[PDB]
Amino acid sequence: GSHSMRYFYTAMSRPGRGEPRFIAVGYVDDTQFVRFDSDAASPRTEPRAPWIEQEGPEYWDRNTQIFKTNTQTYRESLRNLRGYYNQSEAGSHIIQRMYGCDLGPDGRLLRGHDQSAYDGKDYIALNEDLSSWTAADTAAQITQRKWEAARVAEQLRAYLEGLCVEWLRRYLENGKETLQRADPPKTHVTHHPVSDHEATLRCWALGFYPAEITLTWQRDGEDQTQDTELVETRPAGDRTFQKWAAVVVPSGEEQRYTCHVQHEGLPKPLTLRWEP
């Protein structure tokens, strides 16, 4: 239904070990499709999804130039922020940026995004109006002044409402057999005694795509949010994801527990119980 495109940039300084490394990766929903690493033997934008391979040489050269140029700009930016915070030239720091567009279930731009962080803390972000900024502190205020003077917001709005959506729609069509295919989770419940009067019920969700999913345990129809151990959704390595939720229950009360699964690929929500 809904879709998004995001580029994630990571620029990391490393005093004494060369110039800052710049890495960029591009995603359509939960599928990465391109990468660029300034540390590669030969820095170039490279395909990471089959459907992007059909793009011509001009695409790959244009992208490589963009990322090569960003490599230099982000190095300047790291020097600038080091200064804004009166930091030593001896520490390592990181600037991260993520931007992209969200489309609704009809193909129209739902909203745009452009956020930056410094050493893992929000630094500056383009507001939802795509015309104003929110700076985290007086340092970010300096960056804001620069960007307004350079009309950066206008450049982002043009991109987000234009090129971003146009190319996302192109990718969705070229890779429709995968990007527009939701794979439902294969589910089951396992039972692991932990003592004579308690056992662990673990609800599994495997092989699903996209990553968005909801796993919950109910006791007599009541959600066990506080007593449920939910691991982070993890990649299987074949594009799909895995996840599980576990709850320790009193031996003999297993049937009072039900696992509920919600995922875009399921013809209908699932309700499972342990089956001895």
Partner: peptide
Amino acid sequence: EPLPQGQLTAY
């Protein structure tokens, strides 16, 4: 497709 270089404005 990524954000064009444009004016290459540093932070």
